[PDB]
Curated annotation (Swiss-Prot), chains A, B, C, D, E:
Keyword Oxidoreductase carried by entry: no
Residues with the Phosphoserine modification: S342
Name of the molecule in the record: Glutamine synthetase
Residues annotated with N-acetylalanine modification: A1
GO biological process per UniProt: angiogenesis; glutamine biosynthetic process; intracellular ammonium homeostasis; positive regulation of erythrocyte differentiation; protein palmitoylation; regulation of endothelial cell migration; regulation of sprouting angiogenesis
Binding site for Mn(2+) 2: E135, E195, E202
The species this protein was found in: Bos taurus (Bovine)
Listed GO CC annotations: cytoplasm; cytosol; endoplasmic reticulum; mitochondrion; plasma membrane
Membrane topology: Lipid-anchor
Residue numbers bearing the Phosphotyrosine modification: Y103
GO terms for MF: ATP binding; glutamine synthetase activity; metal ion binding; protein-cysteine S-palmitoyltransferase activity
Enzyme Commission code(s) on record: 6.3.1.2, 2.3.1.225
Gene: GLUL
Post-translational modification (record): Palmitoylated; undergoes autopalmitoylation. Acetylated by EP300/p300; acetylation is stimulated by increased glutamine levels and promotes ubiquitin-mediated proteasomal degradation.
Amino acid sequence: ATSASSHLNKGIKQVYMALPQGDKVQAMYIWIDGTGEGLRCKTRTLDSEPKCIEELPEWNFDGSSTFQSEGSNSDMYLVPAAMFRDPFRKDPNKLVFCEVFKYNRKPAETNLRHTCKRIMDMVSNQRPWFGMEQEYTLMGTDGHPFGWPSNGFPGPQGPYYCGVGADKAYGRDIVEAHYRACLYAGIKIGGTNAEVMPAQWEFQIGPCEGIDMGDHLWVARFILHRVCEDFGVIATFDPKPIPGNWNGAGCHTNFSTKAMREENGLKYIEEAIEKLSKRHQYHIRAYDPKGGLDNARRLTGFHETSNINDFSAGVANRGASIRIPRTVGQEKKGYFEDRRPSANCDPFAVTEALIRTCLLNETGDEPFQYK
Amino acid sequence: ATSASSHLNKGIKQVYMALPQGDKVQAMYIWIDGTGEGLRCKTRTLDSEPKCIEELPEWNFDGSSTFQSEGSNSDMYLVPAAMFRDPFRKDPNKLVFCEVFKYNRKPAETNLRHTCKRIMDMVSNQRPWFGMEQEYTLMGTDGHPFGWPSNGFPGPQGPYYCGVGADKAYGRDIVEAHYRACLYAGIKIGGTNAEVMPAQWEFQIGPCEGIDMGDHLWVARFILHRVCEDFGVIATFDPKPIPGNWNGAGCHTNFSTKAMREENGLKYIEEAIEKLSKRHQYHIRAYDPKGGLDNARRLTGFHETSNINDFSAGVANRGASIRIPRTVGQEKKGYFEDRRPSANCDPFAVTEALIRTCLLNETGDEPFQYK
Amino acid sequence: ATSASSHLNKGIKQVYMALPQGDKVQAMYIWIDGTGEGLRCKTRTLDSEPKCIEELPEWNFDGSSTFQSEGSNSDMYLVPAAMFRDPFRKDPNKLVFCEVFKYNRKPAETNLRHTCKRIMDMVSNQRPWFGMEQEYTLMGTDGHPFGWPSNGFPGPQGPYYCGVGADKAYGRDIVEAHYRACLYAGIKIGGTNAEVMPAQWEFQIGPCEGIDMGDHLWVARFILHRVCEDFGVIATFDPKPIPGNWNGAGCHTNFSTKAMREENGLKYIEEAIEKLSKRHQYHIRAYDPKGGLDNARRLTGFHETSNINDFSAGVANRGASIRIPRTVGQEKKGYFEDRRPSANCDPFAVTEALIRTCLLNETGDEPFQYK
Amino acid sequence: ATSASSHLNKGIKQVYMALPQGDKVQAMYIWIDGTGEGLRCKTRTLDSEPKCIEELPEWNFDGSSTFQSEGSNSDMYLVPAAMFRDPFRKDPNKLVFCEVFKYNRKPAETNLRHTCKRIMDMVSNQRPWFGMEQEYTLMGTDGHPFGWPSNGFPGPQGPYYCGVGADKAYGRDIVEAHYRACLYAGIKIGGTNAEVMPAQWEFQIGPCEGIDMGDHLWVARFILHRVCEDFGVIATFDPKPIPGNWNGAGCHTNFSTKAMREENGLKYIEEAIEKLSKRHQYHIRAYDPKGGLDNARRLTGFHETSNINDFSAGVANRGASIRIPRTVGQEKKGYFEDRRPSANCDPFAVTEALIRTCLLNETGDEPFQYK
Amino acid sequence: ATSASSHLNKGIKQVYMALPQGDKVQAMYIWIDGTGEGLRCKTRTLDSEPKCIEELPEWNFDGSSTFQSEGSNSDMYLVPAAMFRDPFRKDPNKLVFCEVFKYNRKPAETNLRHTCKRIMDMVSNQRPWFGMEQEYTLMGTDGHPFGWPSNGFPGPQGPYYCGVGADKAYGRDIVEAHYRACLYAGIKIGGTNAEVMPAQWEFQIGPCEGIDMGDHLWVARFILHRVCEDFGVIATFDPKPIPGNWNGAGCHTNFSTKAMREENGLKYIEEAIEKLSKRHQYHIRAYDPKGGLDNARRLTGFHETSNINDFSAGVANRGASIRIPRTVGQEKKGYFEDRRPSANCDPFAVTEALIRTCLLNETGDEPFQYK
Ligand SMILES: [Cl-]
Ligand SMILES: [Cl-]
Ligand SMILES: [Cl-]
Ligand SMILES: [Cl-]
Ligand SMILES: [Cl-]
Ligand SMILES: [Mn+2]
Ligand SMILES: [Mn+2]
Ligand SMILES: [Mn+2]
Ligand SMILES: [Mn+2]
Ligand SMILES: [Mn+2]
Ligand SMILES: [Mn+2]
Ligand SMILES: [Mn+2]
Ligand SMILES: [Mn+2]
Ligand SMILES: [Mn+2]
Ligand SMILES: [Mn+2]
């Protein structure tokens, strides 16, 4: 069942969107709220099209309304971090992804980009590249997956993965609209597929260098939510939307450095993985917005997943925590895939943990300060 | 009853599809899954429009999710085989039909194109031409034919074949969209008609030379599934969707060589047919994805069909296994029609069997190796 | 689709029908209108329960409202002919079947009972017995048969005749209610069955002596219409409600005399049939309210019917105009079945024609006067 | 979705059924049609309540309308075999289960009772007792199980077997009505349970001696169909209504003789089973109306079933062809259960095969004549 | 939204239930399945009304279908434990609550009554009395509470507790039917009220002596499930059906001995409570079918609940783990209320834990063997 807003005449809205807007420009400021997994937005009018992110003014909002502050000093600040073209309003309107700061200009608790950028600047010469496979499930407003029988289940899994046809793929209109919307916005979207669970989908973001991975994925998530809002359905990043023999949603992260991409870079890939072998618990905590409880429902070691309590790595191992692609093993260079991160992970937390363990050789149960 | 996805606002999707996509190009990789009758697809982003099939990278997928592998080494490989223009995304986006290979680069079990291409290259000088009349039935998501009364039947057969009017043709919107989509994509689609069963239709693919017959028909099937997915109905290639006095769906194959097309080519047509007379059982096994059990429900010798257990040929014989058209008999040259193949046949299997029996003079119950 | 009246709360009506009515008695006067196939009724209050038909007063109605008169002298008269218990109002209320007379006390044009009674009194000593198998079709208010798919057809005929189950018998609630209502009223109803056409049914009336056959069948028809009115569906006696391979409705008439029932009564059965052989056209005109045009659609000689233009008789011959039952042939006594009469026949016309031809040895194209 | 007849006001019908019917009695004649699995019925009026089965007259019907005859001599004969009280019409109305005979008084092809009674009379002194567990599935008129999501599936099997609650048991109203209707009719119904498949149920018939097993089960099936017709749903005895991981429906047959019931009767139980071990193919053909093709879909050896191609017996073996109950093994006396027969089996065929193999020591592939 | 079974005509079922059943009697055998919280049932026919529980035969079922066994020896045994009058079938039909035993006659894992009865027999002279306040929530088949707005919430809590009116009490028809059904069955039901959460209700069972507390509550739960099944809604005993500011469901247990009920019995009440003070963790594990995880969602110390991690007792303390009623404090005698147990608790586990701690002075983390 789709939302009441989706039943409003879309024809009418278009007619208003066809009006020439004139000299004023709309900027939509996007930020992460106090849950560390929700996105918030609002719009301001600018006098002219900004040429770069530097021209965008800082803004503010009430943190007590976003689970981000309490009491008197609840005013929070928005500092623009990345700019994109607005696919919902078209050029010259912009999407402005912002960092959140408290009233005293300290980073907000869900502001993970502030530290993530400092870590990325530390290893800039090694040029870390990331890719994330964002899995998501389309849901009706009733909390049941989009397209599934009322209070019931479709046929067993098997035909839905990369499926085509009215009985195989549910809500491809949303997937096509999102893909185009991301390409128009300047998001580094690498592809899409239908997932094993019906009404479950995936888009790939990358390759992205350093802090660009978190910006591109967060804005790609925002566009998906905004596109799904137009169609009147919900995109969930819950790692296990439906209990039982229905696939979880993960965010598989591909990681490579300049050394790993160069000839005979497999030795550096293996060195990074054995470093990851010794910090499995540290990464599980970082790979989930609430410390790894959500990912416990997904990482059961059954549905092409690994076990949350046990670390494993191998070439072409779908069930392993870390997978080296078969081609990467043959070519002796390229990347490796971390399959642990949950679909509702913060990419700033995930990328920072990979750099700290693999590149800065950090150890122990707490992140190093100033290094 | 049409699917929940078909009830999403199509206006909205269009608005996103009207965005200029920019420099990136979408390629949809299409392959045959482990059932030998189902199609799978997913999309990747390319940096630029590929000029030919050679520029497309090889890709991969999980075979355990497509009924094509089990256990550890379930990664399969996609090798592009034919390129077409994407009618769902428009130029410069592409449809990429691929062959499937196992982890050790051996052909997949449902990869029949690999052997079919080798056979076609063997008889290239004789220039074999094919044409296939693909019959299909439109169905609602409930498994009942599109347009038929709820839990009931329309009037008896007689007015539906090539019918026009709301009470004669069911789901012509899908037929028109598919026809155009195929013409835009570069599929060699020769025409369409309404079939004797209401909601049953047919499109002709050809003439196609050698391996092009399987590529064009498989992609034409994919476009039909994708077009039907947009309208929220199902296209079935079941050889007998409805039991009783309702027509089956076949894939009648027209075959000719350079010798048969030349003046007094009827003698070569008759020589090919008498060779087919001695291998009826071998062809029945090849003409069906599960060895000829599905086609047993269609080949009953009643509804303009032949008997599955008996071979027959004649000029202008609709009830025969092989038909020589009346014009071909008069002109003493042209083609002959194999009416045996089921609607859910693999064209690679059908074309290969015709070349082996008629052109390579193969005998016995198993295909010759290396010849 | 059932009528708006059927959607009124039946619970409420019952509550009013549970009131004790007291000393006054309701009599429903029933008569045949000017179409010769429609029934009309209205109710009057009596001071007390009538002990016999003789105690019921004569009544009147406006003939211009029943297709039975025009101009100034349109008042018609109702003379009670047969009394029955009212199954819709229960004892002591009555159903009063009446003959219709013009303003000058001459019989109305659709009053066939007046002449039929005189003929029956002429052959009273021979004690003619009749039985009629009244076939009818239940229809929705839309003119489509009850239970059939909207604007469509059920499966082919074969499982519906005497069928049980939700997919075999349509509207058995009406059949059960009618059967009981007739038994309560004192109608000589001999049994029921589901017919070959789905939603088609039959009840048997008889054996009835002389004029009782027309009274019992006409009142049985009235009760069926009144019972169907309660359920909000229509009972049609159309001889061919649906064109094509769907069975017609007939009213098969069984006829025997005292001579035919006695030992070695087959010789008298054969003598009656050979007399019927010479008057096929006279009986076809009498067996239909509009001279035999309706029965032309049924008597096609295909669906267990005979040909309207040709007479035939035989033992156990379903396709014959006249059938001698196999048991009657073996026992050399009993009855014979006239299968010619249409479902919308007037039983007074049918019984009178059988007596005139078989017992009074009448010949020619017009009924004898005074004999 | 329930039938159009089920939407007619049941209140109204009751009001007519509350009328006192008077001196006339209704008898519903029930017989098996030409499919050997379908039941047919019709009603006649009797002058008085029959005291025993001997007082019921023989009747007849058209065999060409029941798949039981063709051409001229299509009249078939009904000979009453067992009488029961009518639960749909109440006392004194009767249900009359009849044998079918051709025009020349030879048994009809689906008349298996005629031979079954002769075999039972042969072993009368050994007093064979039978019990059958009739499994069935409730279905909507759309051919989907009653209560299941539209075009979908309920949760996996596990909670439905003997389940209580709106999410566990589907259509218990039908089960309760059938159970009572059978108890009122005088059917030897021993109990009911909810089956593993949701909307699937079972009733036990027995213990019944000799020919009474077929009469009681066939009439119990008729009452279920008639009760389901009232509720507007379909009872199917298809051995595998839904493909996949959904339980089949069987008719498990319990068999014991006077010797097997007596002290140390286990030796006679084992002797009967080893005789059954040598005739597995003969029994599989008899245990299915179409020679064992339907039961091939059920007897897969997976869902608490045995393999159709392999015979096995054991104590407390659910997966065996023949099961000796654990209590019977301990007490060294009682019965054994044949778990092979399909839900749509003819009990006359099943009981006759058990007596021929176990008691008459018949061998070979054809039944013995006159013994 | 109510179930498809609830939409079947209840009038029809009644008509069948009005048939006199005759000499045979129905017994419904009820048992606890392998989840320790679900109930299963099936029916058998008895020859006569059983006078006591001793006359009921032992029965059996397949444990592999009830989550209670696996592999070959999956047959389980039902031993009748308590008898009640059947409120769904009326006298003389019975409800038979049974204990479950394995194939080797050892108690089933969810058979807690076997040990509970032995403990109750040990302290029989002290005459322990119990009372349980069973809270439950009515839910639609969609998993949303009965009566709540579609995908939404009613007004805040405050008017629903003991509320009257269409906007205050949801599904009182079920509560009235259950209350009467329990009184007819012979269940010791002491009263009902509407709970603070709308669509949430409670019934009190008791006072019951020893093992009667578990029998009465389990059968009361079965009747509620069966009554809710008739109305087409679900009764859930989930301790927290809806997250947030919506009340949990508990099963508050009242406990008293002969000493506590006698004059100046408060000293024995205080001695029992201080013994309970030292075994808080042991009781939390016993008070929940899955070791206390479900009750963690309810025992938050906010909505009139206590904290799961902390024990507290006091006079008239709603927020305490143990409450002494104000009247009991004043009269210096009576009972105390354990407010810890979850709504889905097993009463056999709860009553046994209270007797072991308070009366048998058991200590440690495991129950004493043989004492
Ligand atoms: Cl905004
Ligand atoms: Cl895709
Ligand atoms: Cl009136
Ligand atoms: Cl009937
Ligand atoms: Cl039951
Ligand atoms: Mn994936
Ligand atoms: Mn991956
Ligand atoms: Mn065709
Ligand atoms: Mn053709
Ligand atoms: Mn008839
Ligand atoms: Mn007849
Ligand atoms: Mn069973
Ligand atoms: Mn059994
Ligand atoms: Mn309470
Ligand atoms: Mn309390």
